[PDB]
Amino acid sequence: GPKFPRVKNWELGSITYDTLCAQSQQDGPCTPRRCLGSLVLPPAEQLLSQARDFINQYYSSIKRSGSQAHEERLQEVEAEVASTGTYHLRESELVFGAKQAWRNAPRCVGRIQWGKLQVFDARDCSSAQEMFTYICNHIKYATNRGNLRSAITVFPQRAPGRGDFRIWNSQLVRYAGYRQQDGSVRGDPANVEITELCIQHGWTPGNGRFDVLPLLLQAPDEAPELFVLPPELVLEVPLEHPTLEWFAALGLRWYALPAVSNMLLEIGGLEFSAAPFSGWYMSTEIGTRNLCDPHRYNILEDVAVCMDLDTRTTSSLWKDKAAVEINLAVLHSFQLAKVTIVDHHAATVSFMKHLDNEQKARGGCPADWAWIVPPISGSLTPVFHQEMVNYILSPAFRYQPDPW
Amino acid sequence: KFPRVKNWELGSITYDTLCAQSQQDGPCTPRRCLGSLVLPRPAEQLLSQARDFINQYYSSIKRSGSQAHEERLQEVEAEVASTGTYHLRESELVFGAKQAWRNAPRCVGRIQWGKLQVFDARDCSSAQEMFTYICNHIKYATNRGNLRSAITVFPQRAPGRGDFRIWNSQLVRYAGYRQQDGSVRGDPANVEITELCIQHGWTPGNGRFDVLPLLLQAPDEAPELFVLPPELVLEVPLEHPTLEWFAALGLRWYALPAVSNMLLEIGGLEFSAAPFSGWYMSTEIGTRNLCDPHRYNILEDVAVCMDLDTRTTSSLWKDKAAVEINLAVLHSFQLAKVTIVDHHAATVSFMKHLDNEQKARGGCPADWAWIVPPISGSLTPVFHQEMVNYILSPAFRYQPDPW
Ligand code: HEM
Ligand code: HEM
Ligand SMILES: CNCCN(C)c1cc(C#N)cc(CCc2cc(C)cc(N)n2)c1
Ligand SMILES: CNCCN(C)c1cc(C#N)cc(CCc2cc(C)cc(N)n2)c1
Ligand SMILES: C[C@H](O)[C@H](O)[C@H]1CNc2nc(N)[nH]c(=O)c2N1
Ligand SMILES: C[C@H](O)[C@H](O)[C@H]1CNc2nc(N)[nH]c(=O)c2N1
Ligand SMILES: [Zn+2]
DSSP states (O other): OOSSOEEEBTTTOOEEEOOGGGGOOBOOSOOSSOBOTTOSOOOTHHHHHHHHHHHHHHHHHTTOTTSHHHHHHHHHHHHHHHHHSOOOOOHHHHHHHHHHHHHTOTTOTTGGGTTOOEEEEOTTOOSHHHHHHHHHHHHHHHHGGGSOOOEEEEOOOOOSSSOOOEEOSSBSSOBOEEEOSSSOEEEOGGGHHHHHHHHHTTOOOOOSSSOBOOEEEEOTTSOOEEEOOOGGGSOEEEOOOSSOGGGGGGOOEEESOOEEOSOEEEETTEEESOOOEEOOEEHHIIIIIIHHOTTTTOOHHHHHHHTTOOTTOGGGOHHHHHHHHHHHHHHHHHHHTTOOEEOHHHHHHHHHHHHHHHHHHHSOOOOOHHHHSOSSSGGGSGGGGBOOOBOBOSSEEEOOOOOO | OOOEEEBTTTOOEEEOOGGGGOOSOOSOBTTBBOTTOSSOOOHHHHHHHHHHHHHHHHHHTTOTTSHHHHHHHHHHHHHHHHHSOOOOOHHHHHHHHHHHHHHOTTOTTGGGTTOOEEEEOTTOOSHHHHHHHHHHHHHHHHGGGOOOOEEEEOOOOOTTSOOOEEOSSBSSOBOEEEOTTSOEEEOGGGHHHHHHHHHTTOOOOOOSSOBOOEEEEOTTSOOEEEOOOTTTSOEEEOOOSSOGGGGGGOOEEESOOEEOSOEEEETTEEESOOOEEOOOBHHIIIIIIHHOTTTTOOHHHHHHHTTOOTTOSTTOHHHHHHHHHHHHHHHHHHHTTOOOBOHHHHHHHHHHHHHHHHHHTSOOOOOHHHHSOSSSGGGSGGGGBOOOBOOOSSEEEOOOOOO
8 A cells, every 4th residue: 555665574464664764865785676785884065954854853852843942953053064064963962863873773683772872972082091081981881890781972073174083993892813823813803903903003912812902092183092991891701501511611701891882973964983882782692693603703613512412414403502502601601690681582572672662653663684683593583574674864873994 | 886795704705797687676776675575565578588588598508699599589579479479498498497496586405406307287278187297296306205306387377368376385285274262273374275275175184284285276267176195295204313202292294395386487478387396494394384483383392391491581492492393304304314405504505506606697696584594594604695686587476376
């Protein structure tokens, strides 16, 4: 009937229509001739319309659309742009935008929590030293001794001519990756380049599998400066298994706080190049991707040998059995250490509740099926059977090229 | 523009140029991707698709531009101009069907695409003959557990009449009996087709694994009911290699995965009844058919026998039971000497296929959400491989249920 994407849940048989995608201003990578949905990485007049659109979004969310404060906030932005080329956000606009960007993130399964985000304004920040203080404060608050709290810290926006604020690391917490003489990697292969960059900038490297990297923080038009995190601010969890007693002897560990620091937060055409955000982990991120990806820690064969599985034939499902127990260890160990974590079942169920909330609230929810479905036990989770529409809305978290 | 395709495990990059041969449009537009969606929402054009296919065929046999090529283009043109349609040579049909499987973006077993036994059944004029052709297919394809890929191709659609159809979605399906209290005994996916059979005079059973009869439909006639000889339907009882109690659950599955409701399009011609089969990948039985909430739904049952903590999600009881169920299927098929491929072996072979196809055609249409298995996704190499999805012809397509 309706001329919007028809969306079906194959487990439940139910149908919905996504009208929200009509509000998308930005084109994605697809066309009628081919689908590029599986790809990980595929001005004056322009600023105003983005600005006008965002202010419109803001006033709708507080229900004052068409009003005198609404049209005066418009006039105030259009004037400020007309005389300087840019404009500034009010505090409550920034809070709304940060939440809306998270709410808008198609690849995040944790969005049931979007409304509950602690926004630290750091738009006053004027040094790389100051950035470090804001970051330490964020970690302290967000970690909260294992009882994790979502947070974002927003540093000053891009300015015409003047250079960006950048955190060079991809996360606030990352393990070093050390390239060997043989060509292998000790630690995390994901973090090789950033480890090398930290050395180039004078860090004295360690040589463990789990060395917490220092931060490389860059203030406008300055070279980055190197900052070591005080070990006590960085909460970690040693991995053991609830029944396989040798698993603890493996020496495996992970950090409590997932904090993405290299993404750009865009609100009303304003670009916040340093806006680190954090939540808590879904257990498969650590147990499946970080610990079992071939190009990460790659511990599957090690664990399967300890489990005494037949690693000579695929048809033994030794990979499947090891991944299950590793994920179990991650969950059991975070639960033992009283550190917030969510398994892929709980997470996906809660995301299904989120889709229903948003269907009523906005008439749809942009969602990236390949990223939403967990990397183990996919069809065992309800999201596998849920069709999804993906599109870009703004405010948004966006990828940005590396500063170097 | 040509898409840049990256494997994130290896760091390697390819460029898909095969996608420019896509004459058909998919569900996506620049404004929104509709990739995870399962179903889709004149003599001049028939002749153009016919010219393009005939060209494809004569390119395959490396005899392009030849006398036979031109003479065959004349034949096709002449036949369309006069009758509004044309007919394929058996050799061309064989080519088209292989090319259809090759082009199927949702299929992980395309490494096998050149090895396909093609039965021409276009000399079929009754439901009775369809049943005959179908029984021979089943006998050939099953081959006492040494499965071989086959397609039987019934007469093409025609402007002036109803279609040949197999009403069943697969040649072998277990009945699904709706209960007064809403619940379903047997396979819930087959409630509707089980009900169509009963209405057309089938004596039902009361089992979980009752093999359905086939409803075969000759054009503009009511469909007829045909019961498959029990000896033609190879089935495998399920047991587990270390859990004695598993065999007691009485689980079983059939050996032959034979899809019978899709339409085969070759060079504009459409074949509405063209059942095809290969062999199972173990996750289709162990994960989807047996563990889907809306299928046989056996997770909890197995979890309890394993004495697992059903009470919470974080004990990963679902993951554990699912792995044992999949192992039971692989064990059982291996024990019965019936062809099957696990998801690791299957996806490794698909990576080799992508590579072969990158060299042969400059790309390979693939639907990532369907290629990546339903358990242990990132544990297989395809998870880390970017894929481009698009529609090439010849093709398999969905078509409406004929009722
Ligand atoms: C509160 C608990 C949270 C959970 C369980 C969660 C879960 C996830 C997961 C599993 C991913 C997939 C990425 C991967 O495969 O590694 C993801 C991505 C993402 N999350 Fe969340 N998240 C949470 C909080 C947040 C917060 C607070 C924000 C920002 C305010 C956020 C924004 C994003 C964004 C932008 C992505 C996409 C990242 C990319 O494309 O690389 N998430 N999240
Ligand atoms: C030879 C062994 C084969 C294996 C292991 C295999 C495996 C698979 C799998 C796992 C799927 C996804 C189905 C699902 O998840 O439910 C699939 C889909 C498909 N396969 Fe294959 N296949 C094989 C042979 C064939 C053959 C012989 C043909 C046709 C001549 C074919 C054509 C297709 C088509 C058209 C689909 C899409 C089905 C749909 O859209 O619902 N396959 N295959
Ligand atoms: C580990 N597999 C790949 C996942 N990827 C590519 C990935 C890369 C980066 C970065 N930088 C960041 C993420 C998001 C992880 C995340 C973020 C937040 C706020 C919460 C959470 N639970 N996970 C995911
Ligand atoms: C439980 N998963 C089902 C996915 N679906 C909807 C699905 C529907 C139909 C049909 N008609 C067919 C399939 C594929 C079955 C199949 C076909 C072939 C040739 C080989 C094979 N191993 N499996 C899958
Ligand atoms: C090729 C494919 O897009 C890529 O491997 C994706 C698949 N799905 C994912 N899903 C999540 N959540 N995170 C990822 O990094 C990926 N990687
Ligand atoms: C909604 C979603 O696209 C749907 O459940 C798909 C996901 N991927 C799949 N993949 C395969 N191989 N078979 C399927 O049935 C499905 N189902
Ligand atoms: Zn798409």
